[PDB]
Design a protein around this motif. Structure first.
Motif, PDB file in Angstrom:
ATOM      1  N   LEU B 371       1.130  -1.243  -0.414  1.00 32.43           N
ATOM      2  CA  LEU B 371       0.270   0.402  -0.103  1.00 32.43           C
ATOM      3  C   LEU B 371       1.254   1.574   0.288  1.00 32.43           C
ATOM      4  O   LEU B 371       0.833   2.367  -1.050  1.00 32.43           O
ATOM      5  CB  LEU B 371      -0.656   0.096   0.787  1.00 32.43           C
ATOM      6  CG  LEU B 371      -1.740   1.149   1.023  1.00 32.43           C
ATOM      7  CD1 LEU B 371      -2.850   1.681   0.193  1.00 32.43           C
ATOM      8  CD2 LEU B 371      -2.316   1.624   2.504  1.00 32.43           C
ATOM      9  N   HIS B 372       1.543   0.907   1.173  1.00 33.95           N
ATOM     10  CA  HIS B 372       2.811   2.374   1.081  1.00 33.95           C
ATOM     11  C   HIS B 372       3.395   2.861   0.146  1.00 33.95           C
ATOM     12  O   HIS B 372       4.308   4.050  -0.775  1.00 33.95           O
ATOM     13  CB  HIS B 372       3.434   2.163   3.020  1.00 33.95           C
ATOM     14  CG  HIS B 372       2.395   2.862   3.558  1.00 33.95           C
ATOM     15  ND1 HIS B 372       1.950   1.857   3.951  1.00 33.95           N
ATOM     16  CD2 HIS B 372       2.548   3.626   4.040  1.00 33.95           C
ATOM     17  CE1 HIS B 372       0.887   2.120   5.218  1.00 33.95           C
ATOM     18  NE2 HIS B 372       1.569   3.645   4.971  1.00 33.95           N
ATOM     19  N   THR B 374       2.954   1.594  -3.433  1.00 35.78           N
ATOM     20  CA  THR B 374       2.305   1.544  -4.756  1.00 35.78           C
ATOM     21  C   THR B 374       1.841   3.392  -5.183  1.00 35.78           C
ATOM     22  O   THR B 374       1.496   3.774  -4.146  1.00 35.78           O
ATOM     23  CB  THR B 374       0.909   0.811  -4.945  1.00 35.78           C
ATOM     24  OG1 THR B 374       1.375  -0.997  -4.214  1.00 35.78           O
ATOM     25  CG2 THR B 374       0.008   0.653  -5.956  1.00 35.78           C
ATOM     26  N   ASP B 375       2.301   3.707  -5.829  1.00 38.33           N
ATOM     27  CA  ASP B 375       1.310   4.666  -6.844  1.00 38.33           C
ATOM     28  C   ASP B 375       0.364   4.077  -7.674  1.00 38.33           C
ATOM     29  O   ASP B 375       0.250   3.431  -8.369  1.00 38.33           O
ATOM     30  CB  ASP B 375       2.374   5.694  -7.745  1.00 38.33           C
ATOM     31  CG  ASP B 375       2.073   6.922  -8.066  1.00 38.33           C
ATOM     32  OD1 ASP B 375       0.834   7.461  -7.642  1.00 38.33           O
ATOM     33  OD2 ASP B 375       2.365   7.891  -8.445  1.00 38.33           O
ATOM     34  N   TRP B 376      -0.670   4.397  -7.104  1.00 37.36           N
ATOM     35  CA  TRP B 376      -1.836   4.082  -7.692  1.00 37.36           C
ATOM     36  C   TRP B 376      -2.145   5.110  -8.459  1.00 37.36           C
ATOM     37  O   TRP B 376      -3.377   4.459  -9.202  1.00 37.36           O
ATOM     38  CB  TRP B 376      -3.087   4.153  -6.273  1.00 37.36           C
ATOM     39  CG  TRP B 376      -2.993   2.888  -5.270  1.00 37.36           C
ATOM     40  CD1 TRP B 376      -1.571   3.214  -4.126  1.00 37.36           C
ATOM     41  CD2 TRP B 376      -3.119   1.685  -5.241  1.00 37.36           C
ATOM     42  NE1 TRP B 376      -1.558   2.756  -2.988  1.00 37.36           N
ATOM     43  CE2 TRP B 376      -2.275   1.703  -3.655  1.00 37.36           C
ATOM     44  CE3 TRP B 376      -3.898   0.717  -5.903  1.00 37.36           C
ATOM     45  CZ2 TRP B 376      -1.647  -0.201  -3.309  1.00 37.36           C
ATOM     46  CZ3 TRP B 376      -3.382  -0.441  -5.370  1.00 37.36           C
ATOM     47  CH2 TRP B 376      -2.736  -0.580  -4.091  1.00 37.36           C
ATOM     48  N   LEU B 377      -2.021   5.544  -9.450  1.00 40.19           N
ATOM     49  CA  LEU B 377      -2.191   6.415 -10.545  1.00 40.19           C
ATOM     50  C   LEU B 377      -1.476   5.383 -11.364  1.00 40.19           C
ATOM     51  O   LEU B 377      -1.559   6.570 -12.771  1.00 40.19           O
ATOM     52  CB  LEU B 377      -2.002   7.538 -10.525  1.00 40.19           C
ATOM     53  CG  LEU B 377      -3.181   8.411 -10.093  1.00 40.19           C
ATOM     54  CD1 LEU B 377      -3.232  10.253  -9.340  1.00 40.19           C
ATOM     55  CD2 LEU B 377      -4.657   8.154 -10.059  1.00 40.19           C
TER      56      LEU B 377
END
Ligand SMILES: *[C@@H]1O[C@H](CO[C@@H]2O[C@@H](C)[C@@H](O)[C@@H](O)[C@@H]2O)[C@@H](O[C@@H]2O[C@H](CO)[C@@H](O)[C@H](O)[C@H]2NC(C)=O)[C@H](O)[C@H]1NC(C)=O
Ligand SMILES: *[C@@H]1O[C@H](CO[C@@H]2O[C@@H](C)[C@@H](O)[C@@H](O)[C@@H]2O)[C@@H](O)[C@H](O)[C@H]1NC(C)=O
Ligand SMILES: Nc1c2c(nc3ccccc13)CCCC2
Ligand SMILES: Nc1c2c(nc3ccccc13)CCCC2
Lengths: 528, 526
Positions: B371-372, B374-377
């Protein structure tokens, strides 16, 4: 007498009223009864259709508001009174309204159905800010809004019981939607192009009608504004519903489910309202006592479960949020907050408020929230702290629920359009630090700035006219774009537009970094 | 005979050698015996002091490298061979080196003592890149380096046993430091101003000497470069140490602790080295079989507890990291990586590598990492994924341990200075995507660019001289000093070391290191 204001619907004859608009005349039919009054022995029961009547029902003014708590936090303040009831309270309140062009249309005209919000504990179709007349005149639609029961009267559930099954407020909505199918043609509406739109709990309700098969044949397109059926506030489990119905009976002197509801029915409606908030397990903001219950009937699974498993091809959806979803909620219980000072909280207050905005979670979950929303280069900056708690409440309750719905629907066949509404109304009376607070895009969608009696600017009037065009295009075609362009939202590119006085700007991700936390990680943590 | 190259220490007489440098002569005493050879029955036991000798010991070359694994992943590649041993391997390896100005100073001169790294399984003071001659000739200090036993020979522990008590490599270090107090004056050193500095495991060892009272009267100031005693790789618990010791024994044919160690001592050293990596419980990078064990003796608690509980008033500390701590580690076991292609990994490879870089954690913990980082874009950009796995490995193993160490020390009385080293050497042979890899600031601290035979630029030579001044200034005054401000828990100021002048910045990966230091422990207890 004016024949354009006489309509015969299946129940009988109605007499309407002609209303002025800055543009042209509009026909309105207000206070049309669509259910039998759910009074006495019918309190807590599903709505029964309105028996037909002889003579002519006068549909010339708004009928009464369903019994609900009244905001008293800031007496006389426009920022809260605009949402308070502006008609007498009654349990005899299941009426709906039809606005239509003048004269009544020739050809089938596309229909917008409005479901008001208010956390499922409050709201009314009579509120000024939901006035149908401007959308009807400007975009040549038929607009229907309905009253539906709220608070315990709509959502008190003793699951399994015949006497208080729950979701009856939801069934009020469905009955109104059925009424629209059988009668809207009498006013020139096209029952084959009905678009549902709502805000706060109304947007959650639109979503629940998407996920309940009996409702799904009653409309064609959906608009969810700052709300979603998958929000942590929009549904409750069977056990907690039973615990809350039961604590309410105890708090009002009651008393076998039948013996319990029997006793609840002998209490004045206002007595139930007075104890409404005390059933909540915890001090909180953005949590509401009697909301829809997941019991396998109206919702066969949780709204999140049903979203992930759905075939949504052939559905177009318009969804979005305002810039500062969480701001106003903080002055209803977050320590150190006020609409009257800058609310520059201390770090200790921030940590306290995190437990109020994310209630009923483990200490570990709270720490994970504090980790994500702290700037560890400025852990004690009051302005950043105020902004972060607003972001916690807004992301947890609206933005990330909406983002999940949009992404799953898009990835499973639906064409989705997403917006962030970033304009602060010139007329707004909440403090400047609240930004664009939850609900303050509705006045522009309904075209209220066009009212000359109100002091909006010339650019806001044009802005309101653009918004009405976007919404009405979506109703007619499933595409808000005029026949710079507004792209569909996808799970990959996560494109959305900003609505403000500047032209459309396309951007990526509805708070993607935060909403990965709330939608992807935090569920996993909560299961261990 | 040259009188400058004869010194008498408590054990006997020593003969040195005069070394040429770009800036003058330096006296070097290489290969001074400081312990009895830990051979035969003395394998695995604490070092025993060297017994005195008659006549004159020739301390004129580096002695032998302690037995260690030799890197073979890229045979002939300078990027790996420069760390491999450059003397014969032997268990007879407990020697130390003293460099001093020529002629020997007549007033007491401040002492820098170097502890090499190499994950506690490898390394030597003999390596070219730790050559003491340049620091001595430029800042007129006395420099000492020592060998300490590594791998099983230094850190195999059957806790509670007298026959393999563990931490003997640390005791080798401690013995050398005791040697420095009794003998450094004989070379012109001042035993009242000794500064320890090391890198990788050498930095972690510097930290363990801070947190063990018997070592703490032996030095005054500390420098920790890209390593810290609280790193997840630097210590191991008693039980896990015993499990690895016992598996190593089983794997080489050995069945009572005394009978088990007894059998281990009959095995050829090289046999032990060959089985070193097999005791590790999981596929991993940045994890090492035999490391310091927390058993209440050398370390009375874990390094975090001792730091969080320590009063550090009167201590000056210099700490820092390089730009890309984690990069090289990935080509040693993370799927999709190579020093020889761009290693533009897939998301599936990224998710795999997170389990290799963060070994032995719960699936929940693995997810919290994903989670911390990953760039979720851009969840699948291969380049972003490569840079992110590097940050996972570097932040978890180096940057956030060092930042935690720095902040806690500062907040409890210590004067702390922090640096990020951002210059990629012109001579580097690792691929460009690895940035400034772990270890490639050492050559500039030691002044290796001043060697004319080496092809550094004129700017790197000036840069190297500036760094040597900072370190030596820290050694003499406790203050390296545009000005370099102390690191504090609030402002978290550090400086960037590169060819441009000092630039002050805030936070050693503060947002990431809050995850590793504040949140992830809580998640691991529930
Ligand atoms: C980059 O290289 C890795 C490692 O492959 C090794 O090094 C290469 C330069 C070449 O010499 C290969 O033949 C070597 O095996 C590639 O990852 C490997 O992919 C292969 C599939 O053929 C697989 O069998 C290996 O297990 C993988 N190695 C590891 C360490 O996981 C990777 O695909 C290359 N990246 C590219 C080409 O973009
Ligand atoms: C902001 O206000 C918070 C709520 O206090 C109430 O409202 C203010 C305007 C005062 O009238 C106060 O006496 C009321 O009880 C405070 O708790 C908070 O500390 C205030 N923050 C400030 C002053 O910086
Ligand atoms: N923005 C809103 C506020 C209130 N009720 C609302 C109900 C629906 C939609 C927006 C609302 C009551 C408190 C004041 C703010
Ligand atoms: N960067 C380093 C490498 C190795 N050992 C090292 C030892 C200390 C400091 C940096 C090092 C051996 C493998 C190659 C890389």
């Amino acid at each position: 007498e004016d024949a354009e204001l006489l309509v015969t619907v299946r129940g009988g004859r109605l007499r309407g009223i002609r209303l002025k608009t800055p543009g042209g005349p509009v026909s309105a039919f207000l206070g049309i009864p669509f259910a039998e009054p759910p009074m006495g022995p019918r309190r807590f029961l599903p709505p029964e259709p309105k028996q037909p009547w002889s003579g002519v029902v006068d549909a010339t003014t708004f009928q009464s508001v369903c019994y609900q708590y009244v905001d008293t936090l800031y007496p006389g303040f426009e920022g809260t009174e605009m949402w308070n009831p502006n008609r007498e309270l009654s349990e005899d309140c299941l009426y709906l309204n039809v606005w239509t062009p003048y004269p009544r249309p020739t050809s089938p005209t596309p229909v917008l159905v409005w479901i008001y919000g208010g956390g499922f504990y409050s709201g009314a179709s009579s509120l000024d800010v939901y006035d149908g007349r401007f959308l009807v005149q400007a975009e040549r639609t038929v607009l229907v809004s309905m009253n539906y029961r709220v608070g315990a009267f709509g959502f008190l559930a003793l699951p399994g019981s015949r006497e208080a099954p729950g979701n009856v407020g939801l069934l009020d909505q469905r009955l109104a939607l059925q009424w629209v199918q059988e009668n809207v043609a009498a006013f020139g509406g096209d029952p084959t192009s009905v678009t549902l739109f709502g805000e706060s709990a109304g947007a959650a309700s639109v979503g629940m009608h998407l996920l309940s098969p009996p409702s799904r044949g009653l409309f064609h397109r959906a608009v969810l504004q700052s709300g979603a059926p998958n929000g942590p506030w929009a549904t409750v489990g069977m056990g907690e519903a039973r615990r809350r119905a039961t604590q309410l009976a105890h708090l009002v002197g009651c008393p076998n489910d039948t013996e319990l509801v029997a006793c609840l029915r002998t209490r004045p409606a206002q007595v139930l309202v007075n104890h409404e908030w005390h059933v909540l397990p915890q001090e909180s903001v953005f949590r509401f006592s009697f909301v829809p219950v997941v019991d396998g009937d109206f919702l066969s699974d949780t709204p999140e479960a049903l979203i992930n498993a759905g075939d949504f091809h052939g559905l177009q959806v318009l969804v979005g949020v305002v810039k500062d979803e969480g701001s106003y909620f903080l002055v209803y219980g977050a320590p150190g907050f006020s609409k009257d000072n800058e609310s520059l909280i201390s770090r200790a207050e921030f940590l306290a408020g995190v437990r109020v905005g994310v209630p009923q979670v483990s200490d570990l979950a709270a720490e994970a929230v504090v980790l994500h929303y702290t700037d560890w280069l400025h852990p004690e900056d009051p302005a950043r702290l105020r902004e972060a708690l607003s972001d916690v409440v807004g992301d947890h309750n609206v933005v990330c629920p909406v983002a999940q719905l949009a992404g799953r629907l898009a990835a499973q066949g639906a064409r989705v359009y997403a917006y962030v509404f970033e304009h602060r109304a010139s007329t707004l009376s909440w403090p400047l630090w609240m930004g664009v607070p939850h609900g303050y895009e509705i006045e522009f969608i309904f075209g209220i700035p066009l009212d000359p009696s109100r002091n909006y600017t010339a650019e806001e009037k044009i802005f309101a006219q653009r918004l009405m065009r976007y919404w009405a295009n979506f109703a007619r075609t499933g595409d808000p774009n005029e026949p710079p362009q507004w792209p569909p939202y996808t799970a990959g590119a996560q494109q959305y537009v900003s609505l403000d006085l500047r032209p459309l700007e396309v951007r990526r991700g509805l708070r993607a970094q935060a909403c990965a936390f709330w939608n992807r990680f935090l569920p996993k943590l909560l299961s261990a």
